[model samples]
Target: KVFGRCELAAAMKRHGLDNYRGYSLGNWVCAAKFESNFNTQATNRNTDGSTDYGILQINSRWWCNDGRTPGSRNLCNIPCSALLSSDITASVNCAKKIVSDGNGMNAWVAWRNRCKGTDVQAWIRGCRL
Candidate 1:
């Protein structure tokens, strides 16, 4: 199925809690923009020199064993690449659960506010993942 940006944003809003209103959206957008340029099907290696993959940069070697199988969860059970292969909304929702306990969107917003003018990498580093 084809997923649009508004659909993705709405999905985030639906799953995200009330506490994740402003800052969470900012974080979600920032993460989407920085990680994949808002491309729902984006994938890449971890900047930390690991085998991380997918939109949210889920680590393949550490999260699941599917790195070689196209969609297997390596160390973490949920395959890292699934973040790329699965439904975009589901992937972001899963990421929200994994990173923020459904609260990570807020973290993303806080990161933006705290580091908007500074380098994104520096902000990411300070965020501590």
Candidate 2:
């Protein structure tokens, strides 16, 4: 949750998200910045009543269950809490599946509204990508 900028970039690099599924890692960095400022424990309660989880803000609507939702799609088959943990495997893997789900990063309004076409190189500043 408290990952350094370069730390997160390194993990993304290890996870092979940069340019994976046709999305640049810069975009992933930017999206993560805005979603939760890279805080894995970050969770936002949406007006629609669903919560978003982790640095990527995977939504409860289709990815994970918040435990109160009667029937969540939970397509990622993970608990919402998993995404909010210090370990990022579940959250990162879910994000990989999400970007390839046809809509791509467009599935994230924050990415479309803020990260797209913006300068995000600093997200990995000083990282040996």
Candidate 3:
């Protein structure tokens, strides 16, 4: 599924992460570029035995239990499939909640500066989301 910029902006807004959209668009794209190359169906395995999936790289073990059967320890739940399900808005919003308690855009800015050497001020100033 293709996620347009406006869709991403709306998703951010829905998650209460709107303030940093100007910065976040690039950050999201950057993460997408690195993690899944904008592919919504992305999945990766971590050494901790957890799996990251979908556009926002949601951890499967945390958000969803769709496939789990009652009283079955061996039943594994499906990951949140926002990206896979073509619900980018829900996915981004859910990710924001998971990552930042609804302040995901700001958190993303901090993350960019700390991990990717991005200039938050410049990003905020240059883009007027």
Candidate 4:
């Protein structure tokens, strides 16, 4: 699913990402925008041969086991393909795991580059949440 900005923001909030470990919903919204442009099926291949999957671009190296990354921890304990579903449940859950591991929102480079210390409220502004 290619989600609208508010659509993705509301979905992330529903999954308990709002203000999660100090990262606001707008920060997540901004991260998603840069990472995948709100598309569920987005993907990217790292130069190291690892792949990033789904909207949040969860990497195969330490998160999902795609059988492609050289050293996969599979910390999320799911197939990398699962992150591509529009449902977004797996992606959100894995993201929480990433933050819970003490990586925080800094786990996503896009967020650090684009959203860090910025006023991201506009990302979720006018959402009915």
Candidate 5:
């Protein structure tokens, strides 16, 4: 599933990504924008043979189990496929865990490089959440 910017913003807000762990909804939206462009089924293979999955591009090595990451702890306790669902509930839940684990929004390089220290308000501007 592909989501329009505001559509993704609103949905994520509903799922509690808004101000989650002191990170703004725009930060999450911005990360999603650059990470996977709101494509639910997005996936990217890493050099280490593990993969990133879903809209937020959760990493398989530490977050989800995909049978490919030899060191996968599955800290999210979910299959990597869960991150690809259009429902986004599981993805959001995992993301919250990632942040609360003291990783903060920097867990995603996209967030660290693109969303961090920026005014991401534009990512969700004109949207009523």
Candidate 6:
């Protein structure tokens, strides 16, 4: 329900995502686009009985728990529902933590296959960030 690529970029910049371990806002948003189709409320169920959450499709496997995945790491230590909302504060914080854990965006398969090595800057070409 958003057409806010510029806004997303601005918030990411204001929150200091400009160069977090080589991940720029353009790369982030490009990953977000394919991960959740740019929808905050998006979710995708995986074959492993884990679910991907929010704009980043953070997985319940290691990032969050839905109380259903046994041995779930809950590394982000927040409910998966927390990411499935309009306010991206929690999501972004968790994302930062995840990336800071040294994986960068590699934890996200969408980023690897689709966004990696692409002209990711084009994703924000017209965005006024």
**Cα deviation in Å at residue 50, candidate 2?**
0.8
In order of appearance, the predictions have TM-scores of 0.53, 0.93, 0.55, 0.96, 0.96, 0.91
Query: What's the lDDT of the predicted structure labeled candidate 4?
Result: 0.92
* Top of the candidates by TM-score: 4
User: How do the residues 1-129 of candidate 6 rate in per-residue lDDT, one tens digit apiece?
Assistant: 453787777766777777777797788888888998778899899999999989888889898989988877898889999988777877788888888877778878889999999998887788666
Candidate 3 residue lDDT tens string, 9-107: 445445555444344454554554455545677777656565566666665555544343232221223445544666665566555555554554443
lDDT of each: 0.49, 0.86, 0.51, 0.92, 0.91, 0.83
* Total backbone clashes of candidate 6, pairs 3 or more residues apart or in separate chains: 0
Residue-level lDDT of model 1, residues 60-124, one tens digit each, is 54454553644434444565556666465446545545564444443334344543554433222
How many pairs of residues collide in model 4?
Answer: 0
Q: Give the CA lDDT, 0 to 100, for residue 82 in model 5.
A: 92
Question: Model 2: per-residue lDDT, tens digit, 14-127?
Answer: 887888888877888889888999899998988877899999999998899777765668989998999988888888899988988998899889999998877777677788
TM-score of 1: 0.53
Alpha-carbon runs more than 4 Å astray in model 4: none
- In the predicted model 6, the residue pairs found to clash are none
Error of 6 at 128 (Å): 2.3
Cα deviation at 66, candidate 1, in Å, is 3.0
User: What clash count does candidate 3 reach?
Assistant: 0
Runs off by more than 4 Å, candidate 5: none
Ranking by TM-score: 4, 5, 2, 6, 3, 1
How many angstroms is residue 80 displaced in model 1 relative to the true structure, after the best TM-score fit?
A: 2.5
Off by over 4 Å in 2: none
- lDDT assessment of candidate 3: 0.51
Error of 1 at 47 (Å): 6.4
Pairs in clash, predicted candidate 2? 1-40
- CA shift at 99, candidate 5, in angstroms? 0.8
Selected candidate, larger TM-score, 3 vs 4: 4
